[PDB]
Ligand binder design. Structure first.
Ligand SMILES: Nc1ncnc2c1ncn2[C@@H]1O[C@H](COP(=O)(O)OP(=O)(O)OP(=O)(O)O)[C@@H](O)[C@H]1O
Ligand SMILES: [Mg+2]
Lengths: 1077, 171, 240, 113
């Protein structure tokens, strides 16, 4: 906790505004306040008279829509001096330094005498306010010219909290009174006096616009404008009572900003409505109660962390929209009512206002999940969470912050279609002041109803909406809008639910003799797509049926249909980003592959069943030792193999799934290492011999394995299952482990590190591998999208020639980071969302100074404890102490299955590691510069190939893409099993064998998966090289040089690049085609 | 177009006068004992004996195990390091550790020269007696090197005695 | 090209290289030196540096023969020692784990001859064969890069011969049981030193070597704080 | 288990007489019983911790566990009729439908009109 307190203080001082810039601003506004009092009074005017008065002036009255007409504007207008005042954060001295800039709110109270008691009807007051703002702007303009400040101050109108009904004047300073360096902008709020209109008549339920339907937004606009100083006085008291208020207020403001929240209006569509002011009020509501029993939830003695946590905990758990709300008094204890108003509510009974009218239900719902999300983080004790809570921005990319994004291009967008516009109607104008406010609600309702349980959180955003317009125009002007609609296009962002997202029916109400209300609306909503169906359960319910595709999710179809039917039949809904990513995933050559959803793992289940049949056979076979256990360890068993397994497609590298065979403990094993290997084979001979006789349908052959350095006697049995699958068998013996340890002990000291590497590979292949596949198999079930994203990620590595060195295991452990540690983001729920998060992590991950340690546990036992965690942390520090630069080891990936962390990341040359970081940085930078679009994503998946010193073009005789089961095909295994080679791609073994020879001089890389990344025929592959710096230059001749060189002088040689070209050319034989240097 | 990143070979994407310069040099020159010795000597000049020892262990591991000549330089530097700035115990530890890894007789020779250079003649005489007892029966050089030392220090009679012992032990 | 010898004594021995379609007079050079070592098996050898790819004895046999014809010298190459292209044979894991069945630079190998008359004859040719590049590079030899071993190495994905594998297991186990049987008797046979000390060998121990390895690998609680008059007296001293 | 299944196992074993034994009985001293009991507890703990419930039940059917116990306890005291007497399931994790389907190796209705 003490670490947290010091961290908080370090943050506060860093963001603390510099007091000199405070004085610079107070010097101005005080002088500005003199200007305002200079402004002369005015007499009563009619709308005709004021129109003439402003007819020729540069200033234009920014009237609110609908503009007053001569008939209804019989009431007059007049301007008097206001009661100037300063409100907002700067009043409470709780502001902070913002690089983008802050805002100084100055409230101008219109005198009461400029009102009638019934001015709160039919926009009467809003009109009176608009002109009064207009009169100030003109006279302020000339007086600004008189004092010669007009040189560096720019004047424009804008909307307060993006409220169209509340235009305001904004003062900003371009580059003595110049406050540009202060990065502040003054905003002149024209608010009404307190209690001018009976607040009872302005309650949300009532109506104030004659046309009856209620007008919560319009009611909020006037009533809030009349209550500004009151909330300043209320907040001011609390800051006195509790000494911890201000630093509590800043923290929330910091937290809110990172999550892309603000006090700006949300009904228009942008995410917001929960800003510092509301976060500030919500404490003052809690500091005077908060519970159902009205008991205090926050004490004035609470420190900064305690106040902050209480509010976050309050939002996370108690509900304010559907069931229950909080009411308090500014001027009486705060109490949580059970009854709910179905909208985010926080009354202020003293003032009869609802502070959360600007909050949308969709926005409010998301705010909880962030509240609930951090509250788990905040209670976390094992890992520090300060950096994630406060010092990380999730709102930079919507796609990282939202699983699926759809952009709907509405028709006729210089005014919107007449048909759609007629839907706006008079009634909804009263309910919804602007069309944008209305249309956002139309989209979210139908989008919310149609997707149903398929989604968790939905946001509808009016892209390209402005809020500030020049003084010469009355309302905002959009290039597409033409003053009609302040937006360009609407983007639908969704947080999908992986469990039910791919459900092929949308269930509905159950059938009954009389059509129920819930049943009726369902039939109306989906129309023809609606059908009444029966299942094999025996149930009869209305439901509509869709079709999966291996290109797009079912959601894409639903929203496309859903919007066009009700919103407008000319809408164009498109998500090309998601579609291309789905395509990049290899498509299996199985029946009905195109209709398979990427969340389907059925291809893997068939392989497991194929294993199970062989699994029974081995047990009942009689051997000198009983079979202790047969453990599958192959890639396809953990849903991480790149291309789905396909029957008989034996050209794929991952075709032969390894399986570990362990016999009962016996004391008779050979004591020597080679004899142990040959003992293990002898069983595989007997297993092979007996298997042939009892089940001649299967076929078998032997192959050597050389992964384990210097253990050259290991032999494996390959079993070819008639279902069309391959398995490799290897025997694990208890004596096997201790024989290595004996080898390290007896080795000379210089050689002990080398033997340790050999042991490291072994424990990676036999011992640790079993634990990995078990943990990754189970955990994948809760994280549905893990199998696709990790495969597509492995694809991405291969295109850039990295899977040759990055052991496949390291690929999974990196790819699972966004899932087990989603903070500050959400769990990936879509293929685009998951893959980028893997790239975002690698980009920002500093592997020399930060270790990566993962809690391979399902979502909330088997979590890491404090002692284990401090143990792994100590390992890294001990390691970096000996290896500060990280040359020998680059990636520290550890878990319970490997506390050491070096098992899955040893031997990677530093150049390759930097590339995975460098490429990740380049990728994310590209997304920031150019948004996710078809062109950008194509770049992500094409290899540069220019940085490598020399490029050798390599080609196979036959196209393998069919033989890899990759649908752009064999149906039985060849009779003579020697033929298996003739449809294989040996480049991966060529590179592996080359690297050893030129380990000290060259780093060669090649595409392991040729079928996927080898062109249309899957037969084009490339060997790219690199020369180490020492041998790039000339070197004196010595025996220990140990590299292929050419002479220049008596004791000088240079790398014989031309010779190395042949030796590469020798291996490929016919395969090598073209060389580049 | 394509995503392309320059191949970064000092992890930057993530004469020598500073730690950064020496560490930067070792990136491309892990097998050069001279760079390691220069970095070690830089720390010793900075009075960072504890750090200078720590670099020595890294040099012993980082240098390729085949580069015996480079390794021999590192161990010799450590022998000079402990002799000049260390105590008797730590020097013995490095010395005993040194004989474990490399040719045992050679390290006896190097520590013996180090004592003569440092003018620790009293310790130098003793280490001959240990060196000659272990290797005198096989190496004529130790006896000759002893006779040089005794003659150089004006002990002719002791040289005659050592020559008699040399004949007794040698084949 | 004018160079014929490195000043440290390594004679350059240039060759011409094959022609292949992918790369449309590229040369590969070897640096050789006479090797001197009292060890008999390493005697009569030629030390070599920067050997061509996958160079087995057969490749040399072609080369030494191609040298023999041009310079009418009789030289027979016996074998190629310490030829480990890929570092696969640095550490003999069999030797480390036990003594039974295994009693035991880079880019270089030792080239042994049958007799001294052969090696000096071959060396004198190597001096001549060096001079050619300065004068007549065109007659330089050609490394085939292809031999029966090369073909076997290339064919990575080849099933092993089940008939061969069974016979390898059979002889290997038959030897091991004999060695295991021979040792286990020696440990438990009443070993006696010359001075009448009987070694202590436990039951179930198998090899004298393991006994040696175990050896290499490998009052205060009974003292009473107050038993003698000085101890209590010392306790009396500290008590006051 | 590795699945967060908390389970209890009961293992039962009996002493036996050697081939050439002449004594009527084959009682084992308590020092052997506590030694054997310690080994049996270790083996059960090792297997279940290093396994899933689905994997664990795959161990029970061939009774490889009983064979492992016998070899471990062979040095201490010869035994017979070694069995896993019972397996109790105390607690279960949150139910995961996704796993349940995978262990067992969706479907459309028929238009009713
Ligand atoms: N939701 C709301 N309901 C009622 N009054 C509001 C609301 N939001 C703002 N106000 C009034 O507007 C004044 C200024 O609003 P604003 O949101 O800019 O305040 P702030 O907390 O100072 O902002 P900032 O985040 O820019 O520092 C507040 O002091 C309050 O008088
Ligand atoms: Mg503000």
């Amino acid at each position: 906790s003490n670490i947290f307190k010091l961290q908080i203080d370090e943050l506060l001082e860093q963001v603390k505004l510099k007091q000199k810039h405070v004085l610079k601003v107070e010097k101005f506004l005080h002088k500005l306040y003199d200007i305002l009092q200079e402004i002369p009074d005015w007499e009563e005017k009619s709308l005709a008279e004021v129109d003439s008065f402003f007819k020729n002036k540069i200033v234009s009255v920014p009237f609110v829509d609908p503009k007053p007409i001569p008939q209804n504007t019989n009431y007059k207008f007049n301007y008097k001096k206001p009661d100037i005042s300063l409100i907002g954060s700067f009043a409470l001295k709780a502001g902070i330094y913002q690089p983008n800039g802050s805002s100084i709110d100055t409230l101008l109270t219109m005198p009461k005498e400029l009102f009638e008691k019934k001015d709160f009807l039919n926009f009467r007051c809003l009109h009176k306010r608009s002109v009064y703002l207009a009169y100030l702007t003109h006279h302020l303009l000339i007086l600004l010219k008189k004092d010669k400040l007009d040189s560096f101050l720019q004047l424009e109108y804008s909307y307060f909290d993006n409220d169209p009904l509340l235009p305001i004047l904004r003062i900003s300073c371009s580059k003595d009174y110049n406050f540009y360096k202060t990065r502040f902008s003054i905003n002149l709020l024209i608010g009404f006096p307190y209690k001018v209109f009976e607040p009872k008549k302005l309650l949300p339920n009532r109506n104030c616009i004659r046309i009856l339907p209620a007008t919560p937004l319009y009611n909020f606009s006037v009533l809030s404008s009349s209550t500004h100083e009151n909330y300043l006085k209320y907040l001011y008291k609390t800051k006195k009572q509790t000494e911890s208020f201000v630093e509590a207020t800043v923290l929330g403001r910091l937290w809110l900003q990172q999550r892309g929240f603000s006090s700006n209006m949300s009904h228009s569509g942008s995410l917001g409505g929960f800003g510092t002011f509301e976060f500030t009020i919500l404490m003052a509501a809690l500091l005077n109660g908060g519970g159902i029993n009205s008991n205090k939830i926050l004490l004035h003695g609470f420190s900064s962390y305690q106040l902050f946590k209480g509010v976050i905990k309050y939002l996370a758990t108690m509900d304010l929209c559907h069931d229950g709300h909080l009411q308090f008094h500014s001027n009486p204890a705060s109490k949580y009512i059970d009854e709910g108003f179905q909208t985010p509510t926080l009354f202020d009974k003293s003032t009869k206002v609802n502070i959360l009218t600007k909050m949308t239900v969709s926005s409010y719902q998301i705010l909880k999940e962030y509240a609930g999300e951090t509250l788990r983080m905040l209670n976390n004790v094992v890992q520090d969470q300060f950096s994630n809570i406060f010092l990380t921005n999730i709102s930079r990319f919507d796609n990282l912050k939202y699983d699926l994004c759809y952009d709907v291009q509405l028709p006729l967008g210089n005014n919107l279609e007449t048909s759609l516009a007629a839907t706006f109607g008079s009634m909804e104008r009263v309910k919804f002041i602007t069309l944008e406010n209305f249309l956002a609600h139309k989209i979210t309702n139908v989008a919310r109803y149609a997707l149903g349980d398929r989604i968790k959180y939905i946001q509808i955003e009016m892209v390209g909406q402005k809020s500030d317009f020049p003084i010469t125009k009355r309302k905002v002007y959009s290039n597409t809008g033409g003053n009609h609609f302040n937006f360009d296009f609407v983007r639908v962002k969704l947080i999908v639910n992986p469990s039910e997202c791919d459900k092929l029916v949308t269930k509905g109400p159950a059938h009954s003799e009389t059509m129920s209300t819930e049943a009726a609306v369902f039939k109306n909503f989906w129309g023809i797509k609606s059908s009444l169906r029966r299942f094999k359960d025996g149930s009869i319910t209305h439901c509509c049926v869709w079709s999966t595709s291996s290109s797009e999710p079912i959601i894409s179809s639903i929203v496309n249909f859903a919007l066009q039917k009700h919103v407008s039949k000319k809408a164009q809904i498109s998500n090309e980003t998601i579609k291309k990513f789905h395509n990049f995933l290899p498509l299996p050559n199985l029946p009905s592959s195109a209709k398979t959803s990427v969340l389907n793992l059925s291809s893997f289940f068939n392989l497991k069943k194929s294993f199970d049949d062989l699994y029974k056979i081995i047990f009942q076979m009689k051997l000198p030792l009983s079979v202790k256990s047969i453990l599958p360890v192959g890639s396809a068993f953990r849903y991480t193999s790149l291309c789905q397994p396909v029957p008989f497609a034996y050209s794929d590298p991952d075709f032969f799934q390894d399986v570990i065979l362990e016999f009962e403990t016996s004391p008779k094993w050979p004591d020597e290492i080679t004899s142990l290997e040959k003992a293990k084979t002898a069983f595989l001979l007997k297993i092979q011999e007996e298997l042939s006789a009892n089940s001649s349908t299967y076929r078998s052959f032997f192959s050597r394995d050389e992964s384990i350095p210097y253990n050259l006697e290991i032999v494996t049995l390959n079993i070819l299952t008639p279902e069309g699958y391959g398995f490799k068998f290897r025997v694990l013996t208890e004596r096997d482990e201790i024989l290595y340890l004996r080898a390290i002990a007896n080795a000379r000291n210089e050689l002990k590190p080398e033997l340790e590497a050999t042991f490291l590979k072994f424990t990676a292949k036999y011992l640790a591998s079993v634990r990995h596949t078990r943990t990754l198999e189970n955990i994948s079930h809760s994280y549905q999208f893990y199998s696709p994203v990790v495969r597509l990620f492995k694809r991405w590595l291969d295109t850039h020639l990295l899977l040759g060195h990055i052991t496949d295991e390291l690929a999974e452990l990196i790819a699972i980071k966004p899932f087990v540690d989603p903070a500050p983001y959400f769990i990936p729920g879509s293929l685009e969302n998951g893959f980028l998060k893997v790239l975002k992590f690698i980009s920002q991950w500093n592997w020399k100074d930060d270790p990566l340690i993962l809690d391979l546990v399902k979502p909330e036992s088997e979590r890491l404890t404090l002692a284990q965690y401090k143990g792994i942390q100590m390992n890294f520090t001990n390691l970096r102490n000996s290896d500060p630069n990280g040359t020998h080891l680059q990636f520290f990936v550890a878990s319970k299955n490997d506390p050491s962390g070096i098992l899955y990341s040893s031997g990677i040359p530093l150049p390759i590691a930097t590339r995975l970081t460098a490429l990740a940085k380049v990728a994310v930078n590209l997304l920031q510069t150019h948004g996710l679009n078809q062109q950008t994503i194509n770049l992500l998946f094409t290899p540069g190939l220019k940085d490598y010193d020399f490029v050798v073009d390599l080609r196979t005789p036959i196209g393998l893409k069919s033989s890899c089961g990759i649908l752009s095909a064999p149906s039985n295994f060849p009779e003579n099993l020697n033929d298996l080679s003739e449809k294989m791609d040996p480049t991966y073994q060529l590179v592996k064998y080359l690297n050893l020879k030129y380990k000290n001089s060259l780093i060669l890389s090649s595409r392991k998966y040729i079928g996927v990344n080898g062109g249309e025929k899957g037969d084009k592959n490339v060997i790219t090289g690199l020369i180490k710096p020492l041998f790039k230059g000339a070197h004196k001749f010595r025996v220990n040089l140990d590299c292929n060189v050419k002479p220049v002088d008596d004791e000088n040689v240079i790398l014989n690049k031309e010779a190395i070209f042949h030796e590469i050319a020798a291996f490929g034989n016919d395969m090598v085609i073209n060389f580049e240097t | 177009l394509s995503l392309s990143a320059g191949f970064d070979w000092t992890a930057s994407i993530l004469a020598p006068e500073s730690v950064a310069d020496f560490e930067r040099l070792l990136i491309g020159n892990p097998n050069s004992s001279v760079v390691w010795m220069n970095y070690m000597a830089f720390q010793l000049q900075l009075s960072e004996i504890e750090k200078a020892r720590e670099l020595a262990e890294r040099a012993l591991k980082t240098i390729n195990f085949r580069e015996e000549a480079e390794k021999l330089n590192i161990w010799i530097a450590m022998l000079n390091l402990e002799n000049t700035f260390g105590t008797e115990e730590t020097l013995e530890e490095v010395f005993s550790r040194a004989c474990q890894y490399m040719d045992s007789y050679t390290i006896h020779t190097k520590l013996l020269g180090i004592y003569e250079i440092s003018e620790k003649f009293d310790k130098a005489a003793e280490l001959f007696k240990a060196t000659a007892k272990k290797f005198g029966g096989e190496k004529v050089s130790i006896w000759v090197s002893w006779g040089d030392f005794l003659i150089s220090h004006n002990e002719e009679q002791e040289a005659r005695t050592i020559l008699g012992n040399a004949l007794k032990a040698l084949p | 090209e004018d160079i014929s010898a490195m000043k440290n004594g390594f004679i350059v021995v240039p060759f011409k290289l094959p022609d292949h379609k992918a790369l449309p007079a590229s040369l590969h050079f070897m640096f050789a030196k006479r090797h001197q070592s009292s060890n008999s098996n390493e005697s009569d050898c030629l030390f070599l540096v920067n050997l061509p790819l996958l160079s087995n004895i057969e490749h040399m046999k072609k080369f030494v023969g191609q040298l023999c014809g041009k310079y009418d010298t009789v030289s027979h190459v016996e074998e190629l020692l310490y030829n480990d292209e890929f570092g696969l044979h640095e550490v003999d894991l069999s030797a480390l784990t036990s003594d039974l069945m295994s009693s035991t630079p880079r880019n270089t190998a030792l080239l042994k001859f049958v007799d001294a008359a052969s090696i000096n004859n071959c060396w004198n040719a190597l001096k001549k064969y060096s001079n050619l590049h300065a004068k007549h590079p065109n007659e330089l030899f050609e490394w085939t890069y292809t031999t029966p071993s090369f073909t076997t190495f290339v064919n990575f994905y080849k099933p092993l011969d089940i008939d061969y594998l069974k016979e390898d297991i059979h002889t290997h186990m038959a030897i091991f049981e004999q060695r295991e049987a021979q040792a286990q008797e020696d440990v438990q046979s009443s070993i006696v030193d010359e001075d009448g000390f009987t070694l202590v060998v436990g039951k179930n121990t198998k090899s004298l070597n393991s006994i040696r390895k175990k050896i290499l690998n490998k009052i205060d609680k009974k003292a009473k704080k107050d038993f003698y008059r000085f101890q209590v007296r010392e306790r009396k001293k500290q008590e006051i | 288990t590795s699945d967060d299944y908390v389970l209890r196992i009961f293992a039962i074993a009996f002493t036996r007489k050697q081939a050439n034994q002449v004594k009527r009985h084959s009682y084992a001293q308590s020092s052997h019983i506590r030694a054997i009991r310690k080994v049996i507890s270790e083996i059960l703990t090792k297997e279940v911790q290093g396994s899933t419930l689905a994997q664990l039940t795959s161990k029970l059917i061939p009774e490889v566990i009983n064979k492992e116990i016998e070899n471990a306890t062979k040095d201490i005291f010869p035994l017979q009729n070694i069995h896993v007497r019972k397996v109790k399931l105390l607690k279960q994790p949150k139910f995961d439908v996704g796993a349940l389907m995978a262990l067992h190796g969706e479907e459309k209705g028929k238009k009713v009109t």
